[PDB]
């Protein structure tokens, strides 16, 4: 049971439909960390007397470490940067914050098949795999009671609320798992009485029945 949350990358469309279901179905106090969220971020979902908002980046440690302060659990909407990363270990060290949630994309493990796997990295800049590689080193480098869930491709459908998870090591054979999936997944470890299963590991969340050599349309 956790009760003070800290989302960083707030703004991002996981993060967004994230702190929409913790405002609805919990009783959670929210704290959002991120660039402009006051004009990011809309009425609906910051006009609550349940939100917070803190505007700053990852290279204002000031201002992260007073997003963080006191949270009970930090969701990372965006494992993206080494930099960053450790911006973020360093103000949880300060803060003596131990909980976190980070979203990161599946394949960097060479976990996908061989079709899935090619097309995967022949549609992402070299950049972006490398920042997200790094992102990932930092954390499990730190001391942190991480679970990092490894996305494979995103789209929307509220209809689409089915996830399964792929333990770290398995063939992660799922092209794609939608947003909405994501977040039920999210919450779904949020409120797991035995953190174990979650304790310092890195987990696929993929849609059951999309074992396709590249994302549905
Ligand atoms: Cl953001
Ligand atoms: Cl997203």
Redesign the pocket.
Known sequence: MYKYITIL????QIAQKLTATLLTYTDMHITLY??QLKTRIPPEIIDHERVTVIEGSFQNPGKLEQAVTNAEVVFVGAMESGSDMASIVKALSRKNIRRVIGVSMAGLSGEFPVALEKWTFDNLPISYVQGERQARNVLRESNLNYTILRLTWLYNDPEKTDYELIPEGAQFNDAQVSREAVVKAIFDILHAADETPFHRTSIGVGEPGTHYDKPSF
């Open positions: 990358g707030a703004a991002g991120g660039r």
